[PDB]
Amino acid sequence: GGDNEVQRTMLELINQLDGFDPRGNIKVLMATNRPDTLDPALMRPGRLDRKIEFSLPDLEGRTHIFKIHARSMSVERDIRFELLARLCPNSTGAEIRSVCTEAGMFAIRARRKIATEKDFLEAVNKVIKSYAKFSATPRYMTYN
Amino acid sequence: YDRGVNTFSPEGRLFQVEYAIEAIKLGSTAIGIQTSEGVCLAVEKRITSPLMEPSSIEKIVEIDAHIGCAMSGLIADAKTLIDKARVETQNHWFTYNETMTVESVTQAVSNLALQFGEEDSRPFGVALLFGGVDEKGPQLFHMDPSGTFVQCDARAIGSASEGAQSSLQEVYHKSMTLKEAIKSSLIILKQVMEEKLNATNIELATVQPGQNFHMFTKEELEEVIKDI
Amino acid sequence: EFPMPNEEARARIMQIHSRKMNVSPDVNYEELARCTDDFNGAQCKAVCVEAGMIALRRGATELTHEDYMEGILEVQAKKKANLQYYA
Amino acid sequence: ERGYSFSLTTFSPSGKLVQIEYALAAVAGGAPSVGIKAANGVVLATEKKQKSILYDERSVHKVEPITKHIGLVYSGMGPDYRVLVHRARKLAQQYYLVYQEPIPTAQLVQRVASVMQEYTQSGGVRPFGVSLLICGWNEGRPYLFQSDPSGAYFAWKATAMGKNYVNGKTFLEKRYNEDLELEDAIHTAILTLKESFEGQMTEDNIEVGICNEAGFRRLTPTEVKDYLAAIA
Amino acid sequence: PLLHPERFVNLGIEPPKGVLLFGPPGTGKTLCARAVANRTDACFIRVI
Amino acid sequence: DTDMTTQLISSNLELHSLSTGRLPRVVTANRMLKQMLFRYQGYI
Amino acid sequence: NQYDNDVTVWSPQGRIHQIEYAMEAVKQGSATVGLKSKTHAVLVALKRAQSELAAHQKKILHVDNHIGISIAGLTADARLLCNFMRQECLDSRFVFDRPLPVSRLVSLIGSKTQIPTQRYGRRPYGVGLLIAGYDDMGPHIFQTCPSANYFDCRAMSIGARSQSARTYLERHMSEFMECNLNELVKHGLRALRETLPAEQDLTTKNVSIGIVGKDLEFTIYDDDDVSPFLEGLEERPQ
Amino acid sequence: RYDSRTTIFSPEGRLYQVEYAMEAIGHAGTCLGILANDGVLLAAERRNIHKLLDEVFFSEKIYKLNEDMACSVAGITSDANVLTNELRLIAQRYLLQYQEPIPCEQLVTALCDIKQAYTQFGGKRPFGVSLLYIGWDKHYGFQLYQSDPSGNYGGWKATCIGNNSAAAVSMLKQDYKEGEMTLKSALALAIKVLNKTMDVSKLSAEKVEIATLTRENGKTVIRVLKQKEVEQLIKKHEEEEAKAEREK
Amino acid sequence: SAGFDRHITIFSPEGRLYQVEYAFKAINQGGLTSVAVRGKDCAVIVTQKKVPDKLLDSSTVTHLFKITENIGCVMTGMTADSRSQVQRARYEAANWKYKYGYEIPVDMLCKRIADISQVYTQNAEMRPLGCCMILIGIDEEQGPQVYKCDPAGYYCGFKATAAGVKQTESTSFLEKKVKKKFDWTFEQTVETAITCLSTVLSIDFKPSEIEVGVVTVENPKFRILTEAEIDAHLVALAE
Amino acid sequence: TGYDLSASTFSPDGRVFQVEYAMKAVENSSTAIGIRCKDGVVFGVEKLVLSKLYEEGSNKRLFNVDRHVGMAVAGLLADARSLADIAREEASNFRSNFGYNIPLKHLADRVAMYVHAYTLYSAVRPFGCSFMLGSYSVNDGAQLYMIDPSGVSYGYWGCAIGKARQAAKTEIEKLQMKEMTCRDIVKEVAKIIYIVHDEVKDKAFELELSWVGELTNGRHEIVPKDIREEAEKYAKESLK
Amino acid sequence: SYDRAITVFSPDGHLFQVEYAQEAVKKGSTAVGVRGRDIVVLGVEKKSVAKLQDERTVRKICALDDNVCMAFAGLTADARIVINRARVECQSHRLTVEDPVTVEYITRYIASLKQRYTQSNGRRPFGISALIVGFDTPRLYQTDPSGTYHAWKANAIGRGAKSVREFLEKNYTDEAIETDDLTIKLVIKALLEVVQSGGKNIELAVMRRDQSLKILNPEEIEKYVAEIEKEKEENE
Ligand SMILES: Nc1ncnc2c1ncn2[C@@H]1O[C@H](COP(=O)(O)OP(=O)(O)OP(=O)(O)O)[C@@H](O)[C@H]1O
Ligand SMILES: [Mg+2]
């Protein structure tokens, strides 16, 4: 039995997307951060023709995200955002925004009105390193 | 597809060597510059504790009296490769009564590296920068876990490889002198390091055609550092 | 039964879906059919459409074989890059 | 814990080597066999019942000799039995070459148990799916042992392995006395097999061997018929 | 394909009529959808 | 030399007879003895 | 599917998928072209540079005074194969005192590379080889694929974006035999440039040439040595 | 899961197969060892005691490795057999090389090293056998040693392994006097702790085997007590229990 | 239950080796049937000869193999595995003759083949050969002897046996036959074999569709009957 | 499924599925036929020229195992070359150990064992090519044998391996191969190959002939160009 | 999914089995070691043994050679194997070349031996980390289950690693190691910063220049603990 009703709704969406009774000038946007569970009929490139993949940003992209999310913050002018971007190798844009917010939070805790580089480094440690893995510094001595 | 060194992927890529480059990425930054005057070679130390002896961090090693090397990644694999390089240099000197060319030294190290899967193990997760003078002049070579190797006028490895490489491309020309190469390497290292640059967070090495000796810097580091 | 398109069938499908496009005569549809194993007819049409869109991106006037290969890569969401260990 | 029933070199979380127990189950699913030791010797009997008349009864003998004074019967897989017989004979010959004296029953049982153990200490090799009941005579004393696929060997006074081994053991402890004789042993073993034998005991359906002072000898079908007539 | 359709019919290419945005969570799929809705100039329907 | 050779041949023939359940032939004993002695090049 | 993990597993369709993936590994390398006239065998390879200032990777390898190869695929497999054929040529010159004919060397290469495709333990050699060589039976341009199948080609091209070069060679094949060395090298350069994108052009820093001729040993021309062949080339229409 | 192979470290750094072997040791029969002035003894339960099992070895759990050494056994039967044979081989190799009995501890370490190998190299299951060692030498006199499937060993004065090992070790902790314990007191303690640990009552003698080690005129005689003396030991224990009943 | 049937060394929880049983099932994959009958002074094997093509050289289609001048064999199952076991048996017979002087008994031929099969069964290195071998030979002081060897390594002597697809029916027919005491003459033995095969197959048995191998006390040489002799035996059977 | 990954695994119904997969891999190759005439054997192989860039004779599927033995491989080409090397080594070893040319029946048997040995282990896969061995001698007549990936070998009067095995066998049975010498069997083979070839699917192709017989003194050699052209003309003349 | 084999790199280039090997060290009792101008000292958290257990066999400080000793932290059996191999190698080095083995050389050998067990599948890595102290010049090195060695002026490994090292960095001064008694007192204080029993669970071994090992008896250690308590009694 499964869902059936949900499967029937998905099948009708499939029919509307492509098949008899042409869909027309209806461009369809679909987003999901788990695509491997989708029906192959839905994933077929007659309904979802182009498959745009969003990947973890590179160093330049992460610098751009840092600049975007720190634009409105009251930070110093000497912050090396390339350093912070390199300090978050596998991190999404949301993690970059959280890092910026945590840097602001650190600058607020001790009541400074300017968020310095050390605040951003502490935020990076608190957001990325503090929850990344269990590879401790003695275990991180394996690489030099 | 990403579980053995003998399994090909639908795209044809070996999804195990790329993981070795990823292992490289989390090492430490190493800059190397080859100029007509010689080879300069800088590394961020990444000190972990004041108790730990800084001389134990062997990011720079002497392959021979004329060729030095810089590592990035696993210490064990890097030291194995460095010992292999020293052994090959000594064997070539023994069997030919001449100093091994840095290209040939890199060739031998790469030949060891390619055997990650050959017999009926895993890639050495470490990039090596081999600087040194030979019969043709100063030379700089870079090698990766796959065993591919290439001469580079100025190469950055380890962490911060992308930013250091970009800045190196910006600030490198053909006719640089050794002193200005050292200055450029040091300023790039300062700009790509989270810790404040001083005499204990980095180490320097250099080779010259007629001055193969002094393949290191000891407390003259501050001389270049405070004149930045 | 409707089977997965054969290599010749895939080449024919690409030729049909490239009828309305300004395809260069040098395109080898047999090579494309070899390069798109396990592609249904919808995927071949998507290959042709993606090749046309890429030719638009390249700012060209006619579709090339390399554009078709890039469309093949795009259809399966792959992104070809120059790996350091190949050269 | 079914996930640990495949590897022979992997302890279960309860610390049980499941594959050895499966080999023992294969042993228990074999043809019934009994072995009983009396004050005059040992008797090993087994059910050689074929699937049809077509099978040649005298072609293969289940009760086999190892030395002049050592015999050995089995319960479990058939083909593994021949391998174990060959290894036991080779071990006996090696012991004779080294020491010039026929191998003691206990020593042969120990070496055969070690041989069976060698097949349980590595993956990709299967344990011997057979259990051996070994009779011997040394130093004016009968000896009866049972070697297992696990390599564990004991010193059974009287036992039964194979199908309905519980029934054979239950029949024993009743008709078995430590002060019996070889003839009484033969009778008791035949009766114990009768407790688990389906059909008439044709002289060709039962194989009996005696380990007495004169050595180990497999009974000819005439003697088996005579004993069956004396019993039935 | 909406603002300047003439760039396609001239080349005889029918543009794709669907896009699947997929990737790791937080990579920016919903942000890109929000931007599309921000400068769509057509009817945008956020299906619940 | 002769003692150990004869003992080894006797053990091998005993194993053979046990595997066959038949009386061993003199031809087999002669063959095994001759091959064993020839393998040692007359050093036994 | 589940038959995709081993070169030792046959698919129900009768294919060895690991073999096909080894073939796919060839196109990861840059395009290389080989072609023979009645007197010369010339192979031109497009070199790839990993950095703006790093040297371009060597693409044409020297095997013997009469045999040289271009590699398209894994660097490790290419180097191992090159070492193997260097050793084979050296052994042939040591024993028979005669250069090893190209056909026998290519047959040995196929035999060696077929072993990984049948016995588990080692992946197939993920590299395509363009073998250019002169012997007493005329110049030869063989190609060796990771599936250990070798083709005696009049003119071949392998690697990324090499289909355009193959079309160019098919179109201009009839003229190759009665061509002098310079004309053959210009045809090879045109075939190589056909693979290049619109913005890219064949400069002296990314083209490697290898020529083996009647009275010429296998010589590799790089950087400035490419310029004599590069000059006089007709500019690509645009 | 990280317990499929002996060479797989758990994320917490625990070898699950080794711990599985250690816990599996609990299935083995209870065997106990007590050190005392001028003596050291092992005791063990016969476990399977079926009436149709002839008792022809008399030492199914106690083995004599060297002239002045003996070992108990608790684990897999085959692993125990191979470990004991290899212990004898190591002791005899040492004696042949040095013309001097192996000084107990070294022997333990030797065997332990081998066990460690089975917990490190792949394709080999860890030796699921733990065994006690009693001995005497010219360096530390009477010694008692405890081994583990992991190849870890330790010196002890009174310890037990197998069924109800924790209860036996607690009882030994309660009723052991360091320095002032003799062979007779050690035998009485072993009998009482076996009675308490074995769920069966009255501790029938044929279900328990005791082997002692004593120095006699420089001959380090190793004795295995026959049934007759175990009868009188059991009777002595019963009469002490009856005398202790007098308090009520 | 049936999750333990992917490696020949894995015992099922019921103590069953499923891969060996699968080899036994693969025995029938050849599609043919062979029947062996041991007479009073002769042994006879008859096997189906299915040549479903006018292009095959009927001489080489034979499933009858001469292991040794006095020991003959008939194979059932996959042809490649059967030929491999045939060459192995021939080598074992040659080794026995070289090492012991006298000719190997059929007893030992099947015993050694079964030992090799068992070794393949216990060590997970080679796939068991799914071919059943039936050996016939005049062993002196024992007369004719017929033995059957299976992929499991279980060799057994038989007064009469069969292998292939129609194994149960042929064995049942023989069991009905060998029970009524009769003079098992050579002609009678061939008659019993051909009648078994025809009854279990319901085929008129043209002489080219079967192959007959014969060993006799009078001439202890493995002889394959010519088509004329097969026709003579068939016409004698019909009347 | 499950009983399908290794050649050492028996399916519950009792068949090695890897072997069958190899057989149907051979089935996908171009057709190649072999016909033993009255006094010899002729092999005719169609070869799909995948690219015009290949020279004529490249990827030739006619292999000379010995001075008198020829092969007509069909299937995976690399496996075919390796099996050709194995057969050549077997023939050379037989010559060096016995002093005379190896009989084609015995050579076929040995190479069949070599093929079968690769269908037993999980470490190696079954050979992906099926081939034909043909020979002629004044003491053994003309002999032809066919070996499949399973390793099964027996002599054939005339056969085909590849895509159109059945289609070529229908046109092979209608020849009285026991009578005519191979001089005309050559053009008959060429006609059969041209008929079985699918021009609309396999595009262009090249027909390669070889023969071993009394007309060739007993050595197996490629058919000379004149006879090949005559046979191709005969095949083309049968368009209706 | 990338932690069930030692030769598989994680997608981010991590050898996860090698990292897991360090948890075995993290489960071991704290071992501290410092080097002075004339002495090398090393204390050990000597956890209380059972009442009936003989503590002679329980040894954590083992002397590789007369000029070099070693204290481990991790699995005890792997430690025994490594110590035996180190002793054999030091004797072999003294055999091949006359001069005695340097502490750096023996540490290099131990690190290489540990590494060679992390390069091959079917071979469990050593689960111990070692502190090797010796004279050639007083030198202190620390190994790693990964196979990397380092030179330290002062470490502490095992259960208390971060805490004892944190105490150590702002305690290892030039005057702290000025006197041998001062260095031993520093080791005692560092061990007492983690081992919260005092005296009964402290075992310190001191090797002086061109001298032999001397395990401190539980009366000299008691005297040093009393002196440390008296010195710390200045707070009131
Ligand atoms: N490239 C980027 N630039 C700036 N911000 C970004 C970027 N990528 C992601 N973000 C931030 O990530 C936040 C959350 O991401 P988003 O809502 O797109 O998640 P998602 O990947 O679609 O996940 P889900 O699986 O829940 O659909 C946004 O609010 C935005 O600020
Ligand atoms: Mg979202």
DSSP secondary structure of I23-41? HHHHHGGG--EEEEEE-SS
Distance (Å) from CA J222 to ligand 2 centroid: 69
Taking CA atoms, J207 is separated from J46, J138, J233, in Å, by: 5, 29, 12
Binding residues of E for ATP: 23-30
Q: How far apart are CA G101 and CA G93, in angstroms?
A: 11
Q: Token pair for residue K45?
A: 């958290």
Q: Does E14 touch chain C (CB under 8 A)?
A: yes
Q: How far apart are CA H73 and CA H28, in angstroms?
A: 9
Distance from CA of F13 to the nearest CA of I (A): 10
Q: Is A94 in the pocket of ligand 1 (CB under 6 A)?
A: yes
Q: Does J113 touch chain G (CB under 8 A)?
A: no
> In chain D, what residues touch I154 (CB-CB under 8 Å)?
78-79
Q: State the virtual CA torsion across D134, D137, D141, D144 in degrees, nearest 10.
A: 0
H helix intervals, D18-104 = 18-28, 79-99
Could you list the residue range(s) of the whole structural domain that residue B135 is in? Answer: 2-228
Distance from CA of F5 to the nearest CA of D (A): 10
Distance (Å) from CA A115 to ligand 2 centroid: 29
H helix intervals, I101-226 = 106-122, 167-177, 186-201
What residues contact residue H199 under an 8 Å CB cut-off, 6+ apart?
none
Task: Count other C-beta atoms under 10 Å from residue A108's C-beta.
Answer: 12
Q: How far apart are CA I22 and CA B198, in angstroms?
A: 74
Q: Does D49 touch chain I (CB under 8 A)?
A: no
CATH number of the domain within which J216 lies: 3.60.20.10
Q: How far apart are CA J127 and CA G115, in angstroms?
A: 12
Q: Is E35 in the pocket of ligand 1 (CB under 6 A)?
A: no
Instruction: Name the residue of chain B whose CA is nearest to C84's CA.
Output: B148
Task: Count other C-beta atoms under 10 Å from residue A115's C-beta.
Answer: 22
Atom of ligand 1 nearest to the CA of A61: 1
Q: How far apart are CA G158 and CA G32, in angstroms?
A: 6
* Ligand number nearest to the C-alpha of E35: 1
SS3 state of residue I51: coil
Taking CA atoms, F15 is separated from B113, C62, F10, G229, I119, in Å, by: 55, 86, 9, 83, 20
**Bridge partners (DSSP) listed for residue J41:** J36, J212
Q: Token pair for residue H25?
A: 């040791």
Cβ density class H75-96: b for 16+ within 10 Å, e for less: bbbbbbbbbbeebbebbeebee
> In chain A, what residues touch C45 (CB-CB under 8 Å)?
45-46
- Given a contact cutoff of 8 angstroms between Cβ atoms, the answer to whether H143 and H105 are in contact is yes
Q: Is A67 in the pocket of ligand 1 (CB under 6 A)?
A: no
Q: Which domains are assigned to chain H?
A: 1-246 (3.60.20.10)
> In chain B, what residues touch C72 (CB-CB under 8 Å)?
none
Give the relative orientation of helices G75-95 and G102-114 as an angle to the nearest 10 degrees. 130
Could you list the residue range(s) of the whole structural domain that residue I234 is in? Answer: 1-239
Q: Regarding beta strands G207-212 and G41-46, do their DSSP bridges make them parallel or antiparallel, or are they unpaired?
A: antiparallel
**Which of C22, C49, C61 is nearest residue E16 as measured by Cβ atoms?**
C49
Q: Token pair for residue I130?
A: 């799914």
- Computed on alpha carbons and rounded to an integer, the radius of gyration of chain H in Å comes to 19
Could you list the residue range(s) of the whole structural domain that residue J189 is in? Answer: 1-238
DSSP secondary structure of H186-199? HHHHHHHHHHHHSS
Cβ density class H35-63: b for 16+ within 10 Å, e for less: bbeebbbbbbbbeeeeebbbeeeeebbbb
**Which of J4, J6, J10 is the best residue to mutate to test the I interface, defined by the most I CB atoms within 10 Å of its own CB?**
J10
- Computed on alpha carbons and rounded to an integer, the radius of gyration of chain B in Å comes to 17
- Given a contact cutoff of 8 angstroms between Cβ atoms, the answer to whether I74 and I213 are in contact is yes
Distance (Å) from CA E19 to ligand 2 centroid: 15
Q: Is A125 in the pocket of ligand 1 (CB under 6 A)?
A: no
Nearest to J45 by CA among J153, J186, J183, J238: J186
Q: Is E32 in the pocket of ligand 1 (CB under 6 A)?
A: no
Q: Angle CA(G135)–CA(G136)–CA(G142) in degrees, nearest 5?
A: 40
Q: Regarding beta strands A28-32 and E18-22, do their DSSP bridges make them parallel or antiparallel, or are they unpaired?
A: parallel
Q: Which domains are assigned to chain G?
A: 1-234 (3.60.20.10)
Q: Do I127 and J105 touch (CB under 8 A)?
A: no
Q: Do D65 and F18 touch (CB under 8 A)?
A: yes
**Which of F19, F25, F31 is nearest residue I99 as measured by Cβ atoms?**
F31
What's the order of all strands across the beta sheet hosting B38-44? Answer: B154-157, B30-35, B38-44, B202-207
Q: How far apart are CA B11 and CA C72, in angstroms?
A: 12
SS3 state of residue H130: strand
- Given a contact cutoff of 8 angstroms between Cβ atoms, the answer to whether H138 and H103 are in contact is yes
Q: Token pair for residue B63?
A: 């392959």
Q: Token pair for residue E38?
A: 């921000």
Q: Angle CA(G36)–CA(G38)–CA(G42) in degrees, nearest 5?
A: 25
Length of chain C: 87
Q: How far apart are CA J111 and CA J146, in angstroms?
A: 11
Q: Token pair for residue K154?
A: 């002062």
Q: Is A33 in the pocket of ligand 1 (CB under 6 A)?
A: yes
**Which amino acid, F31?**
R
Cβ density class D3-30: b for 16+ within 10 Å, e for less: ebbbbbbbbbbebbbbbbbbbbbbbbbb
Taking CA atoms, C72 is separated from C34, C68, G163, G196, I43, in Å, by: 11, 6, 14, 19, 69
What residues contact residue J174 under an 8 Å CB cut-off, 6+ apart?
none
- Domain count of chain I? 1
Q: How far apart are CA D188 and CA J35, in angstroms?
A: 73
What's the order of all strands across the beta sheet hosting K68-74? Answer: K61-65, K68-74, K128-135, K138-142, K150-151
Nearest to A35 by CA among C50, E21, C42, C78: E21
Distance from CA of J112 to the nearest CA of G (A): 17
What's the order of all strands across the beta sheet hosting B149-151? Answer: B60-62, B67-70, B128-134, B137-143, B149-151
Distance from CA of A47 to the nearest CA of B (A): 25
Instruction: Please state whether at least 3 CB pairs lie below 8 Å between chains B and E.
Output: no
Instruction: Name the residue of chain A whose CA is nearest to K129's CA.
Output: A138
Burial class (CB in 10 A: 0-12, 13-18, 19+), J220: buried
The B-side interface with G (CB below 8 A) comprises 1, 5-14, 110-111, 114, 117-118, 120, 142, 146-148, 150-155, 165, 168-169, 172
Q: Is E22 in the pocket of ligand 1 (CB under 6 A)?
A: no
Q: Which domains are assigned to chain D?
A: 2-231 (3.60.20.10)
SS3 state of residue B1: coil
CATH number of the domain within which B79 lies: 3.60.20.10
Q: What residues sit around ligand 2, an ion, with C-beta below 5 angstroms?
A: E 30
CATH code assigned to K1-236: 3.60.20.10
- Computed on alpha carbons and rounded to an integer, the radius of gyration of chain I in Å comes to 18
Strands (E), G107-237: 127-135, 138-144, 150-153, 155-158, 207-212, 219-222
Return the best residue to mutate from A92, A100, A101 for the ligand 1 pocket (most ligand atoms within 8 A of CB).
A92
Distance (Å) from CA D94 to ligand 2 centroid: 77
Q: Does K3 touch chain H (CB under 8 A)?
A: yes
Backbone angles phi, psi at D217, to 5 degrees: -140, 130
- Computed on alpha carbons and rounded to an integer, the radius of gyration of chain E in Å comes to 14
Q: How far apart are CA C56 and CA C66, in angstroms?
A: 13
Q: Regarding beta strands I42-48 and I64-68, do their DSSP bridges make them parallel or antiparallel, or are they unpaired?
A: unpaired
Q: State the virtual CA torsion across K39, K44, K48, K53 in degrees, nearest 10.
A: -80
Instruction: Name the residue of chain D whose CA is nearest to F4's CA.
Output: D97
Q: How far apart are CA D174 and CA D192, in angstroms?
A: 11
Binding residues of E: 23-30
Atom of ligand 1 nearest to the CA of E30: 18
Task: Count other C-beta atoms under 10 Å from residue H192's C-beta.
Answer: 16
- Domain count of chain B? 1
- Domain count of chain J? 1
Which residue has 């040093």 as its token pair?
K224
Q: Do G79 and B152 touch (CB under 8 A)?
A: no
CATH number of the domain within which I194 lies: 3.60.20.10
Return the best residue to mutate from A37, A66, A96 for the ligand 1 pocket (most ligand atoms within 8 A of CB).
A96
Q: Do D97 and F8 touch (CB under 8 A)?
A: yes
Stated as kind and residue range, the H or E segment containing J71 is strand J69-72
Q: How far apart are CA I135 and CA A86, in angstroms?
A: 77
Structural determination approach:
cryo-EM
> In chain G, what residues touch B111 (CB-CB under 8 Å)?
79
Give the relative orientation of helices I106-122 and I79-100 as an angle to the nearest 10 degrees. 120
Q: How far apart are CA D155 and CA D140, in angstroms?
A: 17
Nearest CA to ligand 1 atom 2: A93
Q: Where are the domains of chain K?
A: 1-236
Q: Do I159 and D58 touch (CB under 8 A)?
A: no
Q: Token pair for residue E11?
A: 């080349």
